[PDB]
Design an enzyme around this catalytic site. Structure first.
Site, PDB file in Angstrom:
ATOM      1  N   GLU A 144      -0.168  -5.558  -1.550  1.00  0.00           N
ATOM      2  CA  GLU A 144       0.342  -4.724  -2.609  1.00  0.00           C
ATOM      3  C   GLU A 144       1.323  -3.797  -1.518  1.00  0.00           C
ATOM      4  O   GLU A 144       1.056  -3.386  -0.498  1.00  0.00           O
ATOM      5  CB  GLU A 144      -0.537  -3.485  -3.182  1.00  0.00           C
ATOM      6  CG  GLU A 144       0.088  -2.671  -4.175  1.00  0.00           C
ATOM      7  CD  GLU A 144      -1.028  -1.673  -4.870  1.00  0.00           C
ATOM      8  OE1 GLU A 144      -1.784  -1.096  -3.933  1.00  0.00           O
ATOM      9  OE2 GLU A 144      -1.514  -1.682  -5.958  1.00  0.00           O
ATOM     10  N   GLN A 173       4.265   1.184   3.112  1.00  0.00           N
ATOM     11  CA  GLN A 173       3.043   0.879   3.335  1.00  0.00           C
ATOM     12  C   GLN A 173       2.567  -0.636   2.720  1.00  0.00           C
ATOM     13  O   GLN A 173       3.215  -0.967   1.940  1.00  0.00           O
ATOM     14  CB  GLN A 173       2.037   1.815   2.921  1.00  0.00           C
ATOM     15  CG  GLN A 173       2.381   2.885   2.283  1.00  0.00           C
ATOM     16  CD  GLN A 173       1.330   4.102   2.039  1.00  0.00           C
ATOM     17  OE1 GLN A 173       1.541   5.090   2.611  1.00  0.00           O
ATOM     18  NE2 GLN A 173       0.342   3.678   1.027  1.00  0.00           N
TER      19      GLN A 173
END
EC number: 2.5.1.-
Length: 350
Positions: free
Chosen positions: A60, A73
């Site tokens: 993700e 991230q």
């Protein structure tokens, strides 16, 4: 014929370039490769379905919506083709890798892993890891542990035991105070920043099952900056005017030490996005409403989204997973969490 590890590395590289992360971005992509090398030559259909994304993707991506110097991230799951995700071997190999190659701190990880990464976990998943970077700053790595590894009724016991093993039982009152909807407010993940540096935190994720927006705004009102009116407004806009989390629950993350001190903000609200909208085009419209006062944040958001989506947004949901909200110095800090839809397939008509 592209492997999962190469496809994700390319997506991460393109996103880093879109955010102008420069050399920090290049080193970040190399760290992602270090962490996902072990996926081998697996294609999407070769890997177990992952808990990282609701559609089973094993990665993700998340980006800051605001501010100069956005952070990028990722989260991923240690996985091996032909091995159940709950097998702990892959997760056990990540920590010595990060400690050895990047100087990550393993001391708190090692204090928890014997119990939170057991050989016979009760739940379907046992580990995620992630990293984040901003231009000109060191990469920060983190680990997530599951509080269900001993079964559903053991989450509080496991969490208290984890704090004891880390010598931080003085943080337990933070957990108790976050306990409003007993039985409905449940800790289910624990994350560790894998640094020794002064900013590293232990965080606990809570689920708010069967809650309406006002109730969620009450759990959070105790944390500095969580103005109930602003929180309710964020939820209602991002849920298309719905006033209750019917199916998919609201999630909060509490940084235990920061909730106990004063100088840093200690909670984050996560709103799920793939079940309360017709498609990702509608979700995008809600983000544009939410970020209307910052046309640059929206151009950045659109640029990241376009590099991660590989179909039309109006076809359905599954790209946007979450948007998070945290109070900021002058403005709230929001992040968007996006899926690559790794496993989606569209066969030709019959």
């Amino acid at each position: 014929l592209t492997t999962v590890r190469d496809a994700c590395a390319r997506t991460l590289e393109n996103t880093a370039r879109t955010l102008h992360l420069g050399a920090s971005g290049t080193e970040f992509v190399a760290a992602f490769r270090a962490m996902t090398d072990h996926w081998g030559a697996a294609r999407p259909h070769d890997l177990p379905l992952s808990d990282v994304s609701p559609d089973g993707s094993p990665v993700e991506y998340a980006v800051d919506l605001g501010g100069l110097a956005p952070a990028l991230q990722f989260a991923m799951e240690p996985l091996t083709a032909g091995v159940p995700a709950r097998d702990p071997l892959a997760a056990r190999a990540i920590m010595p890798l990060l400690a050895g190659r990047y100087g990550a701190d393993a001391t708190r990880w090692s204090a928890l892993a014997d119990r939170l990464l057991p050989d016979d976990a009760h739940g379907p998943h046992v580990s995620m890891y992630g990293a984040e970077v901003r231009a000109g700053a060191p990469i920060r790595f983190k680990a997530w542990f599951y509080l269900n590894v001993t079964g559903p009724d053991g989450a509080f016991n496991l969490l208290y035991s984890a704090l004891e093993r880390m010598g931080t039982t003085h943080l337990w009152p933070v957990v108790q105070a976050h306990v409003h909807r007993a039985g409905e407010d449940v800790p289910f993940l624990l994350s560790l920043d894998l640094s020794d540096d002064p900013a590293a935190r232990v965080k606990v994720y809570f689920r708010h099952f069967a809650a309406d927006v006002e109730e969620v705004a009450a759990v959070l009102k105790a944390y500095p900056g969580f103005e109930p009116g602003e929180v309710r407004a964020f939820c209602k806009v991002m849920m298309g005017g719905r006033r209750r989390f019917s199916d998919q629950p609201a999630v909060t993350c509490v940084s235990l030490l920061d909730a106990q001190t004063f100088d840093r903000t200690a909670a984050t609200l996560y709103v799920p996005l793939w079940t309360y909208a017709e498609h990702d085009g509608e979700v995008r419209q809600r983000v544009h409403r939410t970020l209307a006062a910052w046309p640059e944040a929206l151009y950045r958001y659109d640029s990241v989204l376009a590099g991660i989506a590989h179909r039309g947004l109006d076809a359905g949901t599954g790209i946007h997973n979450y948007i998070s909200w945290q109070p900021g110095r002058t403005r709230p800090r929001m992040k968007v969490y996006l899926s690559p839809e790794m496993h989606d397939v569209t066969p030709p008509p019959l």
